[PDB]
Ligand binder design. Structure first.
Ligand SMILES: C[C@@H](c1cccc2c(-c3ccc4c(c3)CC(=O)N4)c(C(=O)O)[nH]c12)N1C[C@]2(C[C@@H](CN)C2)OC1=O
Ligand SMILES: [Zn+2]
Ligand SMILES: [Zn+2]
Length: 232
């Protein structure tokens, strides 16, 4: 009823949207992994009379439910999607999107890692993002490669019209006591990558983590703190 929706409030298989700013929504879904249930976020950005999707809803059935919820709540077609790293909470559902006519994109680094790991593979490669600090425009957003953090390929997304920074899994929510799933992370480089984000997007007003509640710029420093302490 207006609060940001949380893990125990979303049954696995259902999707909720949350209005972040004019023409910007997050999407929230839940999934089970190794016997525990987790929420995860993505983004939706209005692109004229079309929509740009950032990240799947973590699984084929969740992503079908996402498309249905978008049609119910927004009613504009999703024409393109970008996956921000190669894990299943970002690409799981790409096959569903591709069969619904959505053009799917990711960096070549993400596409190679997804293919090698057996995850679903976005169709189109996003060049111009291979060096830390790189940025490219993609419809109504800017894509930025900050360096290795949660994964070596992780991208962040900025919506300049609304000063919304979608950090993906390289950014953690404020209540987080942990660095999350660090299986593919670079804990040594992560603070440096966060510092690059902070330097590049100093006017961000909303910061959205890959899992959990949005907040302000403090999420970035908090993320560096939690990662450094995890490493310690
Ligand atoms: C799918 C995602 C995934 C699956 C399940 C959980 C997560 C989490 C997470 C977020 C917050 C949080 C925790 C975990 C615990 C905690 O306490 N708070 C995150 C994230 O941090 O982005 N990603 C998760 N995979 C799986 C894996 C690939 C590798 C295969 N060998 C293992 O690596 C990930 O990232
Ligand atoms: Zn991940
Ligand atoms: Zn994640």
């Amino acid at each position: 009823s207006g609060e940001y929706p949380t893990v125990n409030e979303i049954p696995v298989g259902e999707v909720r949207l949350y209005q972040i700013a004019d023409g910007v929504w997050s999407h929230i879904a839940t999934q089970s992994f190794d016997g525990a249930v987790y929420p995860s976020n993505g983004l939706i950005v209005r692109d004229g009379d079309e929509l740009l999707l950032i990240d799947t809803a973590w699984g084929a059935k969740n992503t079908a439910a996402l498309l249905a919820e978008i049609e119910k709540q927004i009613g504009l077609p999703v024409t393109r999607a970008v996956s921000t790293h190669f894990h299943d909470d970002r690409v799981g559902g790409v096959d569903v999107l591709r069969a619904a006519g959505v053009a799917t994109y990711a960096s070549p680094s993400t596409r190679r890692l997804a293919e090698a790991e057996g995850n679903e593979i976005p169709t189109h490669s996003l060049e111009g993002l291979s060096s830390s600090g790189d940025a490219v425009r993609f419809g109504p957003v800017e894509l930025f490669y900050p360096g290795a953090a949660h994964s070596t390929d992780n991208l962040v997304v900025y919506v300049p019209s609304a000063n919304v920074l979608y950090g993906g899994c390289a950014v953690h929510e404020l209540s987080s006591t942990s660095a999350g799933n660090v299986a593919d992370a670079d804990l040594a480089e992560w603070p440096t990558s966060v510092e690059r984000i902070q330097k590049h997007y100093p006017e961000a007003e909303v910061v959205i983590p890959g899992h959990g509640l949005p907040g302000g710029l403090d999420l970035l420093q908090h993320t560096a703190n939690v990662v450094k302490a995890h490493k310690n």
